[PDB]
């Protein structure tokens, strides 16, 4: 089917992050290999997805978004990302709800990072948000899907696109995400931190397409 | 060791629920077998000897902080000013998943209202952090959805909550069998709370005895310090 976000339709269902590589040659050759169409960048540090990485308040996230919307010539596409603390890098869903509401009535097209909590993921799509992106595992933990149960509920009732964002460890992790029903996946550390970044990219490139086909194909039951 | 909650210290680390059995004979014989000392009841849908047990009135059925807060006041006076309450603000009768925003709302109100709150919540480690900050005697993240009999669904988040827990942590609801509860204790929980796993087993009173050993076995294993994984 068609992978459409905020009106625009894309080919690659593999969003990819930046800033974790060793240099531009690498990130260039990598996100090139990943086959990604949308690539997110941490403003505070094709289709570019400015994300508020680094923010800890709705007020900070909201300001970073305004200041990125004007550096990108009024582009409303933003990845809201209000974290709790530099330690767990776990989302502060209360502040995220705060900022998400503010950003929506401010003309933005928000793709919001969040926990696997299915009810807060519900409200985020209600107050707007083009897409809700529950995490797979903690950021940079390379753990993969840690709560497939909650992930299924979020997908079952998702009224907007669902993207598993962050926490991925290898190809299979991403394949599984798609198999569960995600519209796309977003990763950074899994690629940029593999011994050979450019290959992991090509791997995920196939990883997310393989699982996406498997989802649509409708797998056999279990004896 | 001693299981202490809100000053009081108990022997059984197995809290048990009510209302899921077939009759009083059953629930009586069951929570009796479970060995539980603290037994929770859904005030809004159920009105056992309080000279034998510590009763934990819970706001099951509430969907707002306003409703949970009202049920708690009306249960605090039916129990002769007892401040022990299990805050439980759910999202919808479907998922029966906690509405952490409303729970934060009510938890704050209840704490500055003299209550001793044991709060039901998600496995979100940061909201579990704030709940202990705004007061709360104990934070009780779920194991699995209520009545899903799924057990620990997110041991990762569960570990973080335990690592940074500044108050007692009780895995509440979602349990499926004995091993599920044993695992919870092994992870580091101070106690466990269940209802459906016991009252819904083919033979409720036995499952009770099972969990009775289940939570003690895992609790000893935690303290014993298990061998590594070669």
Swiss-Prot record, chain A:
EC number: 2.8.1.10
GO molecular function: thiazole synthase activity
GO CC annotation: 2-iminoacetate synthase complex; cytoplasm
CDD domains tied to this protein: ThiG
Keyword Amino-acid biosynthesis: no
Subcellular localization, as worded in the UniProt entry: Cytoplasm
Alphabetical keyword list: Cytoplasm, Schiff base, Thiamine biosynthesis, Transferase
Enzyme class, UniProt record, top EC level: transferase
Family: Belongs to the ThiG family.
Protein name: Thiazole synthase
